Design a protein around this nucleic acid. Structure first.
Lengths: 534, 181, 534
RNA sequence: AAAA
RNA sequence: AAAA
C-alpha cells in the first residue's frame, strides 16, 4: 500500500489518453503519460503513491523549458497538477547511455532509488523514455531482486490497443526461472524450483484450472526437497530408491494433469520436468523393482547405485560419490562371496572392510578405500586427495565396476546347500554341542529370488514337510519344490530359506493352501534367511 | 556396579598378570619366581573363598528366561535381523536352569502342549505353566528349550508313556538359547 | 561470419536515415529501419547475413497493404530492394502479447528461430517493433543462452543521437553476472565468476588500462578454483589456511589495482569481491598466523577451523562440515591432553579416535563421531542421518565448541617437564634398557610458542650447553633460557624442545651467535619436538 | 649432548 | 520341524 513508481522521460508527442490497468478495466484516467494514470489508479486503492522520473538533462532543458513545445507545456502542466490528491514526483538526471560508463551511472541511480525506498512495492513503468534505457532496467531488476526482496511489477502502457497498461512482470520471471533451471540442472538445487511448484499449485487451487490431487504438486515439491537431502547427505540406497520410485509415480500423474491448463506460464515448468526425466530417472535401472529388494545385496541394486554415483558426479557432489563408491564395493564383495544376506549388518560390513576376477575386485577395494579415507578424514596426517585426482580415480573405478559387473553376471556364485525349511529353527548336528545363527527377515520378492536361483543352480535342499506349503509355494511363486519332511542339520556356513506362519495356531493344525493364501493377504506369512556362522 | 564385581575384576587383573608371567616364559622382563607365585596363588585362593561366599547368596538376577518346546528364533515384529546362540544341555543342566528360573520368578513359559507339562512335571518334579502364545526374543533374552530329536508325521503328539521311551534313548533334547543381537 | 538478425515490426513513420554502428563510425547506411542498416554494414565485412521479422498480423495487413500509407509503401519498397547484394529476410506472425499465452507464443517463436539457425551470431535488433515485445525478448535471450551457447549481440538504433546503432549486450550481461553472483554467494561456485575474472584480465591486458601483475587476475582466478576444490573435498586445514592467506594478499593487490580503470563494467566485479570480504575472509581468525603453525594443534587453529565449519554450512556443504567437525574434535582432545605435537600423526589420531571439562569434551566426541559415521558410511546397516537432524546437531556442537573453547583458554594444560636440548639425542635413564621415541620437525614459530609457554608455565628444564645458543635464543626469540650443560634422561612421557645445527661442522667447533644467525638465514638451524612414548 |  |  506504499508504492514507488519509476519511469524515464521522452521527447515525443505526449498525448492525453485513456489509461486502464488490465487486471481492472472498469477504471480509466485521462493523462498524457503512463506513470500518471498508473499513480492515479493506485491512489484509487487507498495506497500511498510516489513517483520518480529519470530525465536526461537534455530532456530537462530541450523539452521542459521550451514553451514553444505545445505538448511539452501540456506535459509540464499535467505534472504540476499531479500534486492532486497527493502524489510525490521528482527526478534524477541520467546520461544518454552512450557507453559502458553511462549505463553504469543509470544502474547506480536505480540502486539509489531502490535502497532509499521505505515502501512495499516498486512498479517499473518502462513505458516512457528512450526505450534503450528500458531494456537495460528490466534486467537491472533481476540483478537487484536477487542481490532486499520487497516486491516487483513491471508495466507498459501500450498506446495502440486503445490504452491498457499491461503487467510485464513476466520478463523478469523468465530470467528468475533461468536461475532456477540452471541451479537445478547443473547442481540439483531445488530451492528455486520449489517456489514455482508451490506457486503454480496455489494458483490452480485458487482457480480450479488443473486438478490438484492429480497434479500432486504438494507431493512433488516435498519429494523434490527430500530427494535432494538424500543426495547431499550420504543416505541408504534404500531411501534413494524409495524416493526415486515415488517421484516417477508422482511425475507421471502431474505430467498427465498439466493439460494446457485453461498466469501459470507452462513451457518452463515443463522444461524442468524433463530435466529430471533426462538427468535423473532416465539413467536409472527402474524395471528391476529395487524398492522390493530392500534387505539384500543384488547386482541390480549395485547397478542402480552405480548410476546414482554417476549422477552425484554430474552435480559436483564428488565426496558423496566416493563414500557411496566404497559402500558399493562392499556390496559387490558381499555378493561375490555369497554373503549378500549380510547387506544391512553393520558388523559384517566392517568385517569385510578388513577381512582372476576376485583379485580384480580386491585391488579395486583397496584403492577405493584409500580414496574414501582421504575424503572422510579431512586428508589429515597427510592423506589428502585433490579434486582432479579424485575425479580421475572415480572414472577409472566406474569403468572397472562395469568390467566386473559384466564378468560377474556370468559368474554363478555357486550357492552350496540352501535348505528350504518351514520353521525358523536352529537344528545342529548331533556331533555338535553349540552353534551361532543369523536370522534375517525377507521380502516376498527376496525370498522368491533366493529360491528361484537355488533351484536353477540346483542347490536347494528342500525339507518342506507339509503338502500345503508345497501347494502355496508353487502357486504364489510358480516354482516346484520337493516335499521332504525330514530332519536337516546346519553345518557351519550352511543357509536356509524359511517360510513360516507368523501366528501360533492350535496344536496339530495344518492350514490348507487356501488358508495360507488368506493369511498372506493380511501378512501372517513370513519369509526368512537363516545362516549358521558357527 | 557393586563392591563384589569390583572385587572379582581386580582379582582377575592380578591373576592375569602373573599367569602371563608363567605363560610367556617371562620374556620381555615379565618373570615371576616360584616362591612369589606360590604366595600369590595362596593369597588368591583366600580371596576366591571370600568371593564364593559373597556369590553363594547373591540373587544373581536372571532376567526373563522363556521356556520353549522348539529351537525357534522369533524376533519382534519390530526387528528385521538377529544373532542367536544355541547350546546343548544335559538333563541335569536343564533341570538346574529351570529350577532356578522358577525360584527367581523369571520364567516365561510358552509351552504349548500339555504332554510337555506332563513330561516336565514327572521327569523334573517341577510344575510349569501351559501357555500357547508367541514370545519374541529381545536382545539379551534367553530361552530354555525342550524338543524331540525326531521329526514325526504331522499332527502326531506322543503320549507321555511313549515319551518315556523317547527319553530313554536320548530322543528328547534340552537346549539353551541366547539372543546376542 | 554467418549471422541471423531478429526484429519486430512497427507502425510509426519509418524515416530514411543515417545509421552507423558505434564501434566503427566511418560506415553509414541510408535505410528506413535498424535491421537493414545493420545487415548492410555486416555484409560490408564479408559476412553471410540473413534477417527475420516478427510481424503481428495486424501490422501485416493494416500497414503493408495500405498503399495509402506513404511511409509504409516506402518501407515495403526498401524491403524488396534489400534483396540487394544478397540478404535473406522473412517473417513469422506474432500475437499482441496481450496476456500469458501470447507472450508464450512469442517465446516459442524465439525458440524456433534459435534452433533452426545454422550460423554463428544472432543480433537482437530490438530497435523496431512495439517495445513491449522487446523488453520480454532481452530476458528471453538470457533464458535461452543458458538453456546451445553460440553468440549474442543486442543492439538499438537510437534515432535522436544523429543515428548510431548501439551495442546493448550489457543488458543480458548483468543478468548473466546475476547468475554468477548468486551461484557463488549462496553456493560458493566459482565457475561462473572465473569467466569474468579471466575475461576482464584479457581486456586490460589487451588494452593496458589496469596493470596486471598488480591485478594478478590470473592468480586470483586460479586461487579461487583451488579454494573451492579445498572446500568441496575435505582437505587439510593447512591447505585451507594457505589458500585463504594467499587470497587475502591477492585480493588486496587487485583491489588496489582496480582504480576506476579508464567495456569492463566495474561495479559488479566489485560487488563480488566484497562477498568474499564478507562471506569468507572477514569471519576468519587471520591475525594469528595459522600458516605459521602448520605442524601442531593449537587453539587458534581450532578457531580458524571452527569458522571454516560455519562457512561450509552456509554453502549447503553439510557433509564436509561433519567430517571437519570430527577431525576438529580430535584436535581439541590432542590439545587438552597435551598431545598437540601428534597433530599430523595418523596413528595417534586413530588411537584417540578410540582411546567437568574433559567429560564435556568426551561426550561431544562420542556424539560427533556417531554423526560422522552416519555420513561417511552411507547410513548403511541402518545408521542413516537426515539433513534436518544433521544441521540441528551441527549447531549444537558448534555452540558447545564455543563453550569448551572459552573454558579451555583458561585451562593451562600444565605441561610437565619440557627439556630444552641442543641436539636431537635420545638419552634414557641408566635404569632403563630400551626406549621408544617420537621426533617432529618444528617451525621457528612453533618452537617459539612451545618455549614461551614452557617458560611461563615454569616447566622448562633447560639443558642448553653452549653460551652462544643461549645468546641466539634470547635474541632471535626474546626469551631467557638457563645455561645448564648437564645430562638429562627421558622418562616415559617426557618431552623436549630441541634447537640444532642442520650441518656437521668439524669436531669441537662452537659457532658464535653471529654465525648462528648466519646459518639461520640460509636455513641451517633446525627446531624439533622429541617425545618418549616408552 | 648443536653428530662421544 | 509352519512354536516337540
Amino acid at each position: 500500500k506504499k508504492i514507488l513508481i519509476v519511469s524515464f522521460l521522452g521527447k515525443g508527442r505526449y498525448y492525453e489518453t485513456f489509461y486502464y490497468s488490465i487486471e481492472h478495466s472498469e477504471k480509466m484516467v485521462k493523462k498524457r503519460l503512463s506513470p500518471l494514470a498508473n499513480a492515479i489508479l493506485e491512489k484509487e486503492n487507498g495506497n500511498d503513491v510516489e513517483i520518480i522520473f529519470f530525465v536526461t538533462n537534455e530532456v530537462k532543458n530541450e523539452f521542459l523549458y521550451d514553451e514553444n513545445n505545445e505538448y511539452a507545456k501540456n506535459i509540464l502542466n499535467e505534472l504540476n497538477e499531479i500534486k492532486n490528491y497527493g502524489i510525490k514526483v521528482s527526478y534524477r538526471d541520467i546520461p544518454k547511455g552512450k557507453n559502458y560508463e553511462e549505463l553504469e551511472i543509470i544502474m547506480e541511480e536505480i540502486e539509489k532509488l531502490l535502497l532509499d525506498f521505505k515502501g512495499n512495492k516498486v512498479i517499473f513503468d518502462l513505458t516512457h523514455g528512450l526505450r534503450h534505457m528500458a531494456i537495460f532496467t528490466s534486467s537491472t531488476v533481476f540483478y537487484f531482486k536477487n542481490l532486499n526482496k520487497l516486491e516487483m511489477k513491471i508495466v507498459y502502457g501500450a498506446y495502440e490497443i486503445g490504452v491498457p497498461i499491461l503487467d510485464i512482470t513476466q520478463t523478469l520471471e523468465l530470467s528468475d526461472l533461468t536461475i532456477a533451471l540452471e541451479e537445478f540442472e547443473r547442481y540439483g538445487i531445488t530451492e528455486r524450483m520449489i517456489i514455482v511448484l508451490k506457486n503454480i499449485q496455489k494458483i490452480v487451487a485458487k482457480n480450479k484450472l488443473c486438478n490438484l490431487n492429480e497434479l500432486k504438486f504438494s507431493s512433488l515439491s516435498r519429494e523434490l526437497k527430500l530427494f535432494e537431502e538424500l543426495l547431499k547427505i550420504p543416505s541408504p540406497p534404500e531411501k534413494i530408491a524409495n524416493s526415486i520410485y515415488k517421484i516417477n509415480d508422482i511425475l507421471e500423474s502431474s505430467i498427465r494433469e498439466f493439460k494446457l491448463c485453461s498466469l501459470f506460464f507452462i513451457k518452463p515448468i515443463q522444461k524442468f520436468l524433463v530435466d529430471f526425466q533426462k538427468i535423473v530417472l532416465e539413467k536409472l535401472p527402474l524395471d528391476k523393482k529395487i524398492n522390493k529388494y530392500s534387505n539384500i545385496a543384488t547386482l541390480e541394486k549395485v547397478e542402480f547405485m552405480k548410476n546414482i554415483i554417476k549422477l552425484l558426479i554430474n552435480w559436483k557432489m564428488y565426496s558423496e560419490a566416493v563414500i557411496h563408491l566404497r559402500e558399493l564395493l562392499i556390496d559387490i564383495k558381499l555378493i561375490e562371496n555369497g554373503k549378500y544376506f549380510y547387506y544391512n549388518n553393520k558388523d559384517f560390513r566392517e568385517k569385510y572392510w578388513m577381512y582372476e576376477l576376485p583379485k580384480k575386485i580386491e585391488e579395486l577395494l583397496k584403492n577405493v578405500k584409500g580414496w574414501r579415507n582421504s575424503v572422510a578424514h579431512g586428508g589429515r596426517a597427510n592423506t589428502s586427495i585433490n579434486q582432479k585426482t579424485l575425479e580421475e580415480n572415480l572414472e577409472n573405478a566406474l569403468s572397472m565396476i562395469d568390467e566386473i559387473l559384466l564378468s560377474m553376471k556370468d559368474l554363478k556364485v555357486n550357492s552350496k546347500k540352501i535348505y528350504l525349511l518351514n520353521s525358523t529353527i536352529m537344528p545342529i548336528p548331533k556331533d555338535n554341542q553349540e552353534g551361532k545363527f543369523y536370522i534375517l527377515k525377507l521380502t516376498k520378492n527376496e525370498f522368491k529370488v533366493i529360491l528361484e536361483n537355488a533351484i536353477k543352480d540346483d542347490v536347494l535342499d528342500s525339507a518342506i514337510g507339509a503338502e500345503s506349503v508345497i501347494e502355496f509355494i508353487k502357486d504364489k511363486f510358480e516354482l516346484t519344490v520337493p516335499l521332504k519332511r525330514k530332519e536337516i542339520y546346519f553345518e557351519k556356513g550352511e543357509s536356509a530359506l524359511v517360510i513360516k506362519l507368523e501366528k501360533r495356531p492350535e496344536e496339530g493344525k495344518i492350514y490348507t493352501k487356501e488358508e495360507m493364501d488368506f493369511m498372506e493377504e493380511n501378512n501372517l506369512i513370513g519369509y526368512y534367511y537363516i545362516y549358521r556362522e558357527g | 556396579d557393586k563392591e563384589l564385581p569390583k572385587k572379582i575384576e581386580e582379582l582377575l587383573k592380578n591373576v592375569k598378570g602373573w599367569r602371563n608371567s608363567v605363560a610367556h616364559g617371562g620374556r620381555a622382563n615379565t618373570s615371576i619366581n616360584q616362591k612369589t607365585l606360590e604366595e600369590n596363588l595362596e593369597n588368591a585362593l583366600s580371596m576366591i573363598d571370600e568371593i564364593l561366599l559373597s556369590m553363594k547368596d547373591l540373587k544373581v538376577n536372571s532376567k526373563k528366561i522363556y521356556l520353549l518346546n522348539s529351537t525357534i528364533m522369533p524376533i519382534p515384529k519390530d526387528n528385521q535381523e538377529g544373532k542367536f546362540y544355541i547350546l546343548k544341555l544335559t538333563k541335569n543342566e536343564f533341570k538346574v536352569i529351570l529350577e532356578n528360573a522358577i525360584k527367581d520368578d523369571v520364567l516365561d513359559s510358552a509351552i504349548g502342549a500339555e504332554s510337555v507339562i506332563e513330561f516336565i512335571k514327572d521327569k523334573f518334579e517341577l510344575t510349569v505353566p501351559l501357555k500357547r502364545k508367541e514370545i519374541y526374543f529381545e536382545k539379551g533374552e534367553s530361552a530354555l528349550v525342550i524338543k524331540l530329536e525326531k521329526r514325526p508325521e504331522e499332527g502326531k503328539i506322543y503320549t507321555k508313556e511313549e515319551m518315556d521311551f523317547m527319553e530313554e534313548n536320548n530322543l528328547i533334547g534340552y537346549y539353551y538359547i541366547y539372543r546376542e543381537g
